[PDB]
Structures are given as C-alpha cells and as structure tokens.
Amino acid sequence: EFKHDGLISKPASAVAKAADALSMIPYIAPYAKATSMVADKIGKIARIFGY
Amino acid sequence: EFKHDGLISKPASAVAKAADALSMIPYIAPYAKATSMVADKIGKIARIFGY
Amino acid sequence: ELTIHSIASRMTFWRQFDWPESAVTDTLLASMSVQPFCIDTVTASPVTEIHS
Amino acid sequence: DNSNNPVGGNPIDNYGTEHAPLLKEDNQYLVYQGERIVSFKDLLRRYQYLNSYWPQETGSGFRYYTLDSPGMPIYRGWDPNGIDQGQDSTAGNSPYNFCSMTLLNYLAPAFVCQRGSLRHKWVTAGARVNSTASVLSATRHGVLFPLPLAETAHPLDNALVGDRRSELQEMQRSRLNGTAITPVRLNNTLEIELPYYSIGQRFHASRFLDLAGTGDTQGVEIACEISDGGNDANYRLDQFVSVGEDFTLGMFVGAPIMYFYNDPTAT
Amino acid sequence: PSANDGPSFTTSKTSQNTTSENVHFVDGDTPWTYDVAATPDETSKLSGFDDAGLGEFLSRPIKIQQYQWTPGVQLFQTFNPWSDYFGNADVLEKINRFRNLRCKLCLKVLINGNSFYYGRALLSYNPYLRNDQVTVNRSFFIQDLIAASNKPHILLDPCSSEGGQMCLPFIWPENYLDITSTGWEDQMGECIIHDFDVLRHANGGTDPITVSIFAWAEDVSLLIPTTVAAQ
Amino acid sequence: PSANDGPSFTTSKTSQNTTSENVHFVDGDTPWTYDVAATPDETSKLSGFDDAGLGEFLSRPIKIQQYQWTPGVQLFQTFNPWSDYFGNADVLEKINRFRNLRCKLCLKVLINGNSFYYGRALLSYNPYLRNDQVTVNRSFFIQDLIAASNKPHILLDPCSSEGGQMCLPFIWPENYLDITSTGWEDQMGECIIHDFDVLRHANGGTDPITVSIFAWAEDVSLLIPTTVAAQ
C-alpha cells in the first residue's frame, strides 16, 4: 500500500526462487483495489503481476 | 494533529467501507480546535468532513 | 454547517401555482422537473436576478 | 466427445516425456534475463514518449499557449482526423499523426471496456530565451463534453491590464477543477494523473480510435507562456504517457486489423 | 471446466432437454455452450421498485368513471365495471395472447364534498345478468331504489364526503371465462348510481362536485397462451 | 362485523391508506366496504400452468433467425439478436409502459444435418459496439475468421449436427438502459455467421438444410413505469 520505502521490501523484478508461481491466476476480491489489496491478500509474490 | 507523515495513515479520500457514515453529524466539543481534536474524538472517518 | 447535506436539506420555498374553479378531473395544475437546480428569475431589462 | 469445442483441446501423444519442462527451471532468470515479465499491467507503467508540441506556432506577441489534449494518447497512423499532414500513396496529402505507438494504444482496441486513471509527464525541452519565468500548468476539463485536441493562444501583452485579466479568465487554470502548476526555470516537469470521473459510467469504449477529433472525458489543458522572439521557435513540450493504478481493461475480443508502414514525408 | 478455457470464459456441454417458459427443446445431442462468465455486482440494479411489476399488471387501478353532481341536478348513471376495466387500451395489450382470465374486480368510489352540500346517492351492483329478464335498467323511478338496496350497494353523500369500496366477486357458471370471444366481459354484472332526490347546497353555491370510480382486478389467474388476438 | 349484516355479506370500514400496485390513495376519512363474502373452492382453477405466465413473458423463446445451407453455397449472415428479440411485435406490447430493462439475452442455434453433409461454420458475437471503429462488418474474407475466433463463438457442422448455445451478457456502461429512446437495443452486440468454405455432400445430394436461431431474455429487471410508448 502507501508505505514508506516500499521498493526495498519487494523482490521487485525477478527470480526470487519461490516466485516461480507465474502459472497461478490472480484472484480479485469483489471490490478489491490495486493498492491496499491482493498484493497482500494473495501472497508475497503478487507484485510480479503488477499489483 | 501535527504529526509526521499523516497522509499515509488516512483513508483520505474515499469509500473506506466503514466510511459510509456520511449521514452522521459531526459533534464539536465546546472549545474544540480543528487540528488536535474531533478527527480523533469522533472516529477514524471524521476526515471526510474536513477535519 | 459547511456540510453539503446540512445546507441542501433545508426546506426552502420555491414556487407557487393556483387551483382554479374551472379546473375539472384530469386537469394539470403544475408540472416540475426532479433535479437540484430549482431557481427563479426576475428580469428587468438590464438586470436579471436569480433567486436560488 | 470433445469434437466441436469452441476452444479446442484433445491432447495427442507428442514428442516429450516431460510435460512443460521450462516451468521446473526455477533459477532460469538468474542466468539469462535478470527479470521476468508476466503481466501487461506491470509493463504498462513504464512511461513512453508520445508527441511533442511547439508553443510558438499559434499566436503572436507575448501570449499564453494552451493545448486541449485527451487523457488517452492519440493513435499513430493515417487518421481521417489527424493533426498533421503526410504525403500518401497517390502523391497527394492526407491527415496523419506523427506520434508514437505506445503499449496503451496497442492493447486498448483489443478489449471491449476501459476504466482507470492515466498519468502524464510534460518535459519542456528545446531552447528558450533568457527572459522567461513562465509557469507550466495542467488542469482538467469536465466529464460531460469531450473536447478535441486543439491549440489556442491567449494574448497577455495588451495595453489594458483588465484586457489581460480577461484573457487569464478565459483559461481552465482559473477554475475550480484540479490544477497543477510548476515554474519552467526551476522544475519544468508536471507529472500529473487524470482520475476517472464519469456521469454514471462504468467504463467507456476501449475500441474508440478517433481521439484527436473527438477527445475523451479525461481531457487536460496544458498551458505555458511564450514570446514571439527568436530562440523560442525551438521551445517545445514533450508528452510522456503511462497508466494509473486503478486502471483495467475489459474482455478480450481479439486483436484488431493492423497495418505496417513507416512514416511518410510530412507535408 | 477443462479443455483449453481460461478464467474469463467457459465451454461446456449442456443437457439435451431445454425448457424456458412454455417452449421445450428435445435435442438429438448435447450442444456446446460458451459462457462469458459475467456476474454483475450489487449497486447495479434499482432496489425497492418491485411494487409495480409486469406480472401484477392487472392490479393497477385505472379511473373507469368520472361524474359531476351539480346542485339542482341528479346523478342517474349506469356503467359496467368489467367492460370498463378490460376495455382499456393498456390492459388489452397485456391480456393479449392468453385465453383464461378468472379475476375479481374490486372498485372504489371517491367523492370530495363539503359541509354545506347534502343529498345522497345509492350505487348498486347487479352480479350476473346473462339470462336475466328482470332487474330493469330504465329511466329514473324512486321505486327502483327499493329493489336496488338489496343488491351490493354503497351510500355516497357530499356532507361527510366518505365511503365507497366494493369487492365484486367472480360469479359465473364456468370457471376461467374466455378472453377471445366477443363480448366476453359485458354480461358479468353492472353498477347503477341512483340519486335519492337531487344535490343541494345550503349557502346557494352552484359549484359541481366530482364522483370518481376506480377499479382494479385483485386475484388474477391468467394462464393459457394462444395466438388469437384477445378482444 | 356487527350492525345489521348477515352471514352472506359484511359491511366494514377500511383504512384511510389504500395501496394497490403503484397507486396510493390517502383518503380523508375511512370509507365503507361491502363484501359479498365470496370464497371459491378448489377444483375451480387450473393447476400446473404456472410455467408460461405474464411476469416471465420475456423468457419465452422466439425464433429470431432461420437460414438454409445448400451444398455448394456458403453461409455468411449477420444479425443483431437484441434488435431481433426486442423488435418483435408481441414482446413490444409487454415492454410498453416501462422504461428500464437490463436483460441477459441467451440464444440457441439448432442445425439438423446428416452424416453425409460436411463443412463447418463459425458463429461469433461482438459484445458492445457503440464507439467501435474496428471489428469490421464487410464481405467475406477467410482472414476475418481469425479475429472472430477470439470473440464468443460456437462451431456448427452438419455431420454431427450438434451444438450451439451462448449466454450473451449485458455489457453496457450504464445500468438499466432506456426503452423509450430511439435505437435503444441496436448497439449492444451482434452475431455473424462466417462459413469456412462451403456446404458439401458426399453422395451428391443437393437438398438444403436449415439453421435456426432462437433467443430469449434470462434475468429481466423491468421496473419503472411511464406513459411514453416504448420503441
């Protein structure tokens, strides 16, 4: 979400060995925003889908 | 009040699902300022009324 | 009193019409549009007052 | 027996023992690429140069250049309503946009619906005269009437101060809509974002190509002071477009018909 | 389910038997189905407007009659509520491709009056009237108010300016009378307003007053579809 | 209750507020009521005929299109299911004094075929098409089947002679599109039948076969009454 220095705490671009869940579909909750949502509600690696 | 990075901790603009108390009237204590007051004394969502 | 709903919820006189003796069943007395902008104008050739 | 399936699908024995073996290579992007690109919504948030605009082409004297542009970037090719004019195949002339083909312009006519905020940057490169202290300003239009892409100059060098103020009040910068200003001598970059306000609209037509002749409901007016002296003839504005964070596209109904050609000679 | 479809859509094989509101399809084989997986949300339909629907269309009141008493002149009027309600142009588009009706037509009388007007009128209802060689419908006699006061009646006055609502039951020897046939609602009971003397006024006012008659069908059983235009 | 009434009838005083299906009556005083106490029995209404009612009228299928393949000739057809269903004469009497519609128009394709006929056609659906300056609707090109195979589509053949049912969701930027306005259903998605080559036959038979397209609205929300004739 809107947090101070959020790029440091991401895996942010890449391999991140447990980030080989590219074959998983993102689930969007029925009124989910992009910011304070599914990037924390799916998992740690939901930031490679753009969230 | 005068705090460091206060815009991050607001819901600040919008839906904020529990912020559908727009039908509530703001109560102003008998010598209440706007800054260190009713935005913390009414509730979390008293910042959509401008406080 | 700077809430929008505190200003807008005030019941304010808007207009006035009449109901004649010659009115019969199914006679229209007034028709009005359901919207916020209920104003009334007073023209007097240079000026045009808008009472809202 | 799966024999008229609209999506097909009946796997017959192919030439591999191991099914989909490149998903089991976890450390593949530690060797070759350094990164993996999975979604377009991540890649749509890179800014890309759209188009440049020269303020000393509209008025005369010292004036205030204003440009009504859509929030969504205009499209790249031979418009019937283009802002420029190119030499076509019949050795004549036709309207043409000399803008770039962004990823947003590529992806949007393949989807039905479109909703979201859109981000712009205005860069103000070129040359300039030493006697400038102008302010570059972006201000949004209403969501009832989409204005087309247009250019206007407001003169500020009149003898009357009131007839200068009446020109500053013909501008969208003077209105209650959202305004961002900056000084060109100190920052020269706006970095604005147009929100998605609407008259009860859940989305709009993502397959609408005529943005330069109609506009959309996220238009913005960009305003900058200009003088008629030389070395301001090279003063321009560069538009970089990207995509806000509440942006989404609808259902995919297939790629459009595409066309491949280089830019013609501008006439 | 399976076989090369994504999260946005679904390809399936539905049943051989397809029923949708009086049309059956007995298919020779299971067809294919492409669903675009479109579930809308709440705040996309207006809530609270289930009162005036299409199924309960015949329960909507229409003003079948309007009359005016003037001081010095009587009301002697005769109308058929079944032929006034179901002779409307807008209900006849809704009872159009049906055959059986079986309603119960409740009516209502509104009179505005004043404390200075006086006099009284009787509104009576004749129930069946098919092979009815009695219960005359003629000009005004004061002795037609004795036979009409045993029928379902209401008393309407301007002084208290009140009252008036009857239920008008179905009574008919068959159940589910036809809508196609000619004059299918005419011989099912009719109302007559007799006046006892004359409308009067105590200050010599001569303004007319209005007697309005509304009607609507209560428990409709409209159920067999046909291709014939319903009269 | 009391006051001189018998077992056959009832005189009462009902409420001042009378509601019956979008008409309210706020009466100045409690009116009088004459009930004839008519309760019918069972075996006076047909039971089991609640399937084709008036409220679910728009769920009734109508045959919007019919075509015939002949061996040697292709099917390239273009139709608008929303403009074919709601352009009917009989549904336009039922959506007549309403304003808001919001349906979901599910259609069905029936093809009879034979084991000797072969060939295949693609029926595709374009969802919204309001400010759509792409997705051409022109003469037949074989390269228009690549763009049309990503839209909601069904494959129809005569050999197995099967398949065909899509759901066609509402998709529209407003909720509850108007019925009064002109061309209110035209720009809401249309179907095109392309043919891949040509209908063929293996014994040299030249008889045509029929492709029938039915359509009906699924979850109707028809709710605001008005006096304007619905186009």
TrEMBL record, chains A, B:
* UniProt domain Capsid protein VP4 dicistrovirus: residue ranges: 4-51
- The organism's superkingdom is given as Viruses
Q: Where in the cell is it found?
A: Virion
Its protein name is Predicted structural protein
* Provenance organism: Chaetoceros tenuissimus RNA virus type II
Covered part of the full sequence, start to end and full length, is: 274 to 324 of 869
From TrEMBL, chain D:
What subcellular compartments does it reside in? Virion
- What are the residue boundaries of the Dicistrovirus capsid-polyprotein C-terminal domain, all occurrences included? 28-258
Q: What is this protein called?
A: Predicted structural protein
Species source reads: Chaetoceros tenuissimus RNA virus type II
Task: Please name the taxonomic classification of the source.
Answer: Viruses, Riboviria, Orthornavirae, Pisuviricota, Pisoniviricetes
TrEMBL record, chains E, F:
Stretches the record annotates as Disordered: 1-25
Give me the stretches of Polar residues compositional bias: 1-22
Top-rank lineage group of the source organism: Viruses
Please state what the protein is called: Predicted structural protein
Organismal lineage: Viruses, Riboviria, Orthornavirae, Pisuviricota, Pisoniviricetes
Q: Which residues cross the membrane?
A: none
Origin organism is: Chaetoceros tenuissimus RNA virus type II
**Where, per UniProt, does this protein localize?**
Virion
